[PDB]
Amino acid sequence: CGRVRDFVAKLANNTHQHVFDDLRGSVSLSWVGDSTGVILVLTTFHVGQSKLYRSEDYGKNFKDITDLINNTFIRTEFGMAIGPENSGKVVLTAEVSGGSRGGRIFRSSDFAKNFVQTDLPFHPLTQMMYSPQNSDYLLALSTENGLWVSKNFGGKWEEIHKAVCLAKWGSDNTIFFTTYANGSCKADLGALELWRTSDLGKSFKTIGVKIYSFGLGGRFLFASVMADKDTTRRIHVSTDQGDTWSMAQLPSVGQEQFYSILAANDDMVFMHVDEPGDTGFGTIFTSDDRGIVYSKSLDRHLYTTTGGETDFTNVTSLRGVYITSVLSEDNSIQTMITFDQGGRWTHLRKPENSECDATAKNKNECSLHIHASYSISQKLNVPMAPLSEPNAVGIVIAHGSVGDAISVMVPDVYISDDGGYSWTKMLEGPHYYTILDSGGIIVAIEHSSRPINVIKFSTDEGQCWQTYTFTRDPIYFTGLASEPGARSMNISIWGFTESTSQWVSYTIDFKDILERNCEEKDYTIWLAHSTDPEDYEDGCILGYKEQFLRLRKSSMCQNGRDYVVTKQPSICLCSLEDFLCDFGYYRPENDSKCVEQPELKGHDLEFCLYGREEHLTTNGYRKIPGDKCQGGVNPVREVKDLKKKCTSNFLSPE
Numbered sequence: 001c002g003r004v005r006d007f008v009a010k011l012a013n014n015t016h017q018h019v020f021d022d023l024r025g026s027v028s029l030s031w032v033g034d035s036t037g038v039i040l041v042l043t044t045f046h047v048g049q050s051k052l053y054r055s056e057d058y059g060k061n062f063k064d065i066t067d068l069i070n071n072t073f074i075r076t077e078f079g080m081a082i083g084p085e086n087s088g089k090v091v092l093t094a095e096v097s098g099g100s101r102g103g104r105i106f107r108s109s110d111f112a113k114n115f116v117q118t119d120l121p122f123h124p125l126t127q128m129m130y131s132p133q134n135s136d137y138l139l140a141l142s143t144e145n146g147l148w149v150s151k152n153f154g155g156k157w158e159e160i161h162k163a164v165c166l167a168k169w170g171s172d173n174t175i176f177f178t179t180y181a182n183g184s185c186k187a188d189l190g191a192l193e194l195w196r197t198s199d200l201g202k203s204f205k206t207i208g209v210k211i212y213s214f215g216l217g218g219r220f221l222f223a224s225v226m227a228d229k230d231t232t233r234r235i236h237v238s239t240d241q242g243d244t245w246s247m248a249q250l251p252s253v254g255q256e257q258f259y260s261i262l263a264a265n266d267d268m269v270f271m272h273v274d275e276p277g278d279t280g281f282g283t284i285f286t287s288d289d290r291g292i293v294y295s296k297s298l299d300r301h302l303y304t305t306t307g308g309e310t311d312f313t314n315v316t317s318l319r320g321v322y323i324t325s326v327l328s329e330d331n332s333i334q335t336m337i338t339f340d341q342g343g344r345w346t347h348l349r350k351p352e353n354s355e356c357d358a359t360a361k362n363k364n365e366c367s368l369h370i371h372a373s374y375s376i377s378q379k380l381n382v383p384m385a386p387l388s389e390p391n392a393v394g395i396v397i398a399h400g401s402v403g404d405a406i407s408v409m410v411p412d413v414y415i416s417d418d419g420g421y422s423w424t425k426m427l428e429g430p431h432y433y434t435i436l437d438s439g440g441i442i443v444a445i446e447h448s449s450r451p452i453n454v455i456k457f458s459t460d461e462g463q464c465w466q467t468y469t470f471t472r473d474p475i476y477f478t479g480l481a482s483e484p485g486a487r488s489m490n491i492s493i494w495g496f497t498e499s500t501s502q503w504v505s506y507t508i509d510f511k512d513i514l515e516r517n518c519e520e521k522d523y524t525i526w527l528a529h530s531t532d533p534e535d536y537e538d539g540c541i542l543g544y545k546e547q548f549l550r551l552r553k554s555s556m557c558q559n560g561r562d563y564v565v566t567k568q569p570s571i572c573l574c575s576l577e578d579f580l581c582d583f584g585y586y587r588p589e590n591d592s593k594c595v596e597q598p599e600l601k602g603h604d605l606e607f608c609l610y611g612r613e614e615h616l617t618t619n620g621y622r623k624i625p626g627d628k629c630q631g632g633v634n635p636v637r638e639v640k641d642l643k644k645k646c647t648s649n650f651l652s653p654e
């Protein structure tokens, strides 16, 4: 089959141990900027003392800098507030004496090399929020519920507004916030006012009233608005930062239900709407590019309370792929996969050489099911949720169960190399997995009940493995650490020695395992989303194909830190399949044509009344958001006003 030679040597000298002398309590880990190797470990003990370690070599060596934080006690509730991109900004929130006028923070703007102790004119209630546009601009909520803003990275603060419940950093240093008038935040629930500040407190605009909550998603601003002399509430959307608002074409909810943004981007949002009264499920809706028109995408979508378990996963290694869990009528849980951004959802293909477990009503015919957030929450034997990396094309790794529903059995690990069209059992039993060098290295740690001393690796995308002993003295494993972006060749194995417990981190560099750097010949041409290769339209997802250049499973070379995923789009001809029904239109049975509804019912009728001209004047069809098809079919429809078909039945005044 093929394996790596003299590998023990290549890794032996590349295995860097480091012990953590004083360690117990809340033990945090933080990476500081890309391509820096900066790791910040922070431990807190309760009698009192706080330990702070720093690295500059991808966690191979740490240098105790507890001295830099003037040997004070840090409140892990706030954690290490790290600055965007490579700003190098780090904020630590220290525990102060009960009497104190305000809180105290430690700030570094040089990747934790030098810290500034800074006392504050208030006590923080929230972690400090860095501005996306300006890393030197911060905002925070006082314990007294006041909005404070720093224009100089924590040095100088000023209470820009008082009675606030929630504040968010928008695009280009703009802030949005909910403001209560009466008692508290919990008292004015659905009575709050939504405000905006373009100039950091200098000017304000009340962009909302009778607000339950608000949130940002891609290009949209959503806000649940409470009904007048009514218990219910509904979503309203604003593409212009609160200047104009349109009602969303979504159902309304009572006080016992919630709305959740499952995923949002520049084209659309996946919106979860809770089903009425303690169901433990809801319905997924996909939006239009305006965030106004909504297409029902998935029924009985498993999502617990607002807080807040769902198996909703974006399969980041391949475009338009998402996986989630649905509740079956017999109260069993099934995994569903979408390949066209929730257009159509279906079961996952069962790994060819895998057996149908006890959950299957058929010995030979069934599907793969995935363990995610929910399995974990129900204390199942799941050490890790699915993992996909945008730089490792088509790779998905997850804990599975082959059958008709999610088994409670001890799961094995499964791998897909084509973004979830086809799967194969990667490893037997639970494991901790990580992707390195954009899929050049796959790493695995066994999830055992007893100490471990070995690590497994694959240079052919989990098709062939090679066990290596990182330590003579085994450890009780906790987790892995690798630099966000899956580009390093460095991995930190964490755990503790068998007791008299001492924490350790064995970091391994795979520089000598993958000595040769990849070249043109190591890459092959791969069409994503291929289904029927003899078809002109094969691979068309959202109107276009993407033909990639992918690393050969056989090739055992290094992509490098500077690797660019290379693809080539091919613009397909529009079919009606590239359009979704606009307001008031529907798709009968199997047919792909959009016919007008005989008569609007439910939340559709509500919108037909309480909505605006633009959205109701259709245009039987609308192009799927993010759909880039050209040519072919264009359903050229005269923009017909529908606020006649609703009012048609209602007797109306003069």
Ligand SMILES: *[C@@H]1O[C@H](CO)[C@@H](O[C@@H]2O[C@H](CO)[C@@H](O)[C@H](O)[C@H]2NC(C)=O)[C@H](O)[C@H]1NC(C)=O
Pocket: 263, 264, 265, 266, 268, 269, 270, 314, 315, 316, 317, 318, 319, 320, 390
């Ligand atoms: C699902 O994940 C993908 C990949 O992370 C998101 O798309 C990427 O978004 C960035 C935004 O800057 C683009 O630069 C990339 O080109 C996108 N990659 C792909 C694979 O398309 C996507 O938006 C996520 N889905 C949702 C609905 O949020």
Ligand SMILES: *[C@@H]1O[C@H](CO)[C@@H](O[C@@H]2O[C@H](CO)[C@@H](O)[C@H](O)[C@H]2NC(C)=O)[C@H](O)[C@H]1NC(C)=O
Pocket: 037, 056, 057, 058, 060, 487, 488, 489, 490, 509, 561
């Ligand atoms: C793994 O960690 C080492 C550090 O232990 C990284 O080494 C850095 O390499 C870049 C060039 O590749 C240099 O500019 C740095 O100065 C190096 N730092 C040190 C301390 O040697 C290495 O890049 C990491 N591996 C990957 C692929 O990210």
Ligand SMILES: CC(C)(C)c1cc(C(=O)O)n(Cc2ccccc2)n1
Pocket: 212, 213, 214, 215, 216, 222, 223, 224, 233, 257, 258, 259, 260, 261, 306
């Ligand atoms: C972000 C946005 C889409 C506007 C939204 C609206 C709702 C809701 O009224 O349920 N939620 C969930 C929620 C519930 C209670 C408190 C905060 C957030 N999120």
